[PDB]
Amino acid sequence: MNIVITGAKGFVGKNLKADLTSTTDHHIFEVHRQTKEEELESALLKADFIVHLAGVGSYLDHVLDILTRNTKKPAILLSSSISKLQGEQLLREYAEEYGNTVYIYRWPNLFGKWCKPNYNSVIATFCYKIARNEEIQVNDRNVELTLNYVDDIVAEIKRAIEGTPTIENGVPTVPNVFKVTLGEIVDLLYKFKQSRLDRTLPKLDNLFEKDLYSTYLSYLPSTDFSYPLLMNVDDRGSFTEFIKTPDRGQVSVNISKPGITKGNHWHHTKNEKFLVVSGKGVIRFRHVNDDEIIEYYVSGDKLEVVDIPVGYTHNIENLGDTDMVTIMWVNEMFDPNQPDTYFLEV
Template sequence: MNILITGANGFIGKNLVAELSSSRPDYTLLRYDMETDPALLDDFCREANFVFHLAGVNRPKEQSEFMEGNFGFTSKLLDCLKKYNNSCPIMLASSIQAELDNPYGASKKAGEDLLFDYGRENGADVLIYRFPNVFGKWCRPNYNSAVATFCNNIANDLPIKVNDPSVMMTLVYIDDVVNELISALEGNPNREGEFCKVAVEHRITLGEIVDHIYSFRESRNSLQLPNLSDPLVKKLYSTYLSYLPVDGFSYPLKMNVDNRGSFTEFLKTPDRGQVSINISKPGITKGQHWHHTKNEKFLVVSGRGVIRFRKIGEEKVYEYFVSGDKLEVVDIPVGYTHNIENLGDEDMVTVMWVNEVFDAERPDTYFLPV
């Protein structure tokens, strides 16, 4: 198939092109944008089997540019398709603003009406999406997306301005938008009446968005991962990370070092415990304790050693020999005192997961040699 994509270098266009190029290599993408030679539009309209009309104007210098960009170019595109009697399906990226009485909304509504008329006259399948606020990677900050602006500014330690934190926002995530557009391309659009829409929408206040994004920044200090079981939080967090400055991808961890080696907390979660990295020097034994409810998983990724267990009240000791040459997870059950000894000549590195974040008030850790 030949897929014409207008606005191919815009936010939605760039994400759509990236996905189609990766997952549908047999499609030919005819990319048209402001920098494209206008003469190519004629060729593209002759060859297209499907049109994604994503081009538009939303922040012009003059209000007259709204109608010129959102209505005028749509008219030009449709005239070009008519010239070659090309009645292939055409999708239009409109906006919920089309329902409002403002210059931008009026221009979007005019483009919608034009496309509906075109579909009736030419028998073309018309797919009009009134998108709410779209967010995700590659969205231009300080332009027309509050999420992009907040993510960019907070990630780069820049100030933000929130006039009314109680304003309710309707959001759609770019991956959900792209998935819907590909479904439309393959003949399965999500229709609601005469319009189409992205099935997955999220409702959240402006203030809640800001709180989440500030918590993402603080997570580097607290080590607390966001609640990624919440679909919106998961999408916001991914979006936030895409705005990190290129010299700010990494951050240091606090290493608790002594003559035995080191212990470093890596990640913490509110409901799935925490992950830490333990380094033991040659000949060193660590542990020698047991837990009532706290349980752990040990994974030696470098070096070699032994993990020993003894059930409370019994004398028999059980040994599990571990090595970075053969990755094997060892569960640390409750009610067993345990230790881990480095049997090698080099440092032994162990990834340790525990089912709860350490609480100094209730450590649930009792010293007892194995």
């Protein structure tokens, strides 16, 4: 199928173009302000489907006029919004005079990667500014925004292309509409930034937050994709926290130099998992009231997880000639009021 995308260099166009050329065999005719009038016409008259992303307005009228001479009666997709609605009745009359299926959508504000900041998306501007430690302006935190993520826009458009749009009360409607306050948005973005300092992760079964997180990351300066962890270092090795959550535990990285033993503690309720990913050694266990010592000989050649059960004192020792690197998951963030850690030599 020959698919024309007008406004193809825009936020949505670029997203759609990349997707269609990645996931279909359709011939994409990009139209934009560098297109010559000849190639606009040529493309329109060959078209099977027209995805119109530029405004309603004189440009569209011109595109529509050319399409009256396209003998295949290609379907046309556009959005009438800008919160005002323009041109709708005229476009229904066009569809009915010339036959073309015309899908009029009423897209709300949009967000996602590749949207130009300091232009006409407030979320692009907040992401851009916040990632660059630039001051933002929030007149009122309680303003509600109605939003669609670009992936859903793209997917709804693809569904229309293959003849199965999403209809609601007799109107094409992209799903996964989000209704959120500015204050909730801004708070999430500042949270994403602060997480490089506190190691926390977003809540990724919240669809809006998930979408916004990926969006925010696309605005990072090229020089800013990495960030330092805090390596607590001494002549025994190091210990470095990587990620913390309130509900799925915390992962850290322990490193022990040759000949080094660490640990010799137990808890009542706190528990861990060790996974040795480089080097070799031994994890030892003893029941607080017993003398039986249980040893697990482990190494990065064979990845196995060792649960650290409660009520056992345990230590970990490097038995090789290189650094021994262990990933260490713990069931809960450290709480100064309930450290739940007791020193006892295995």
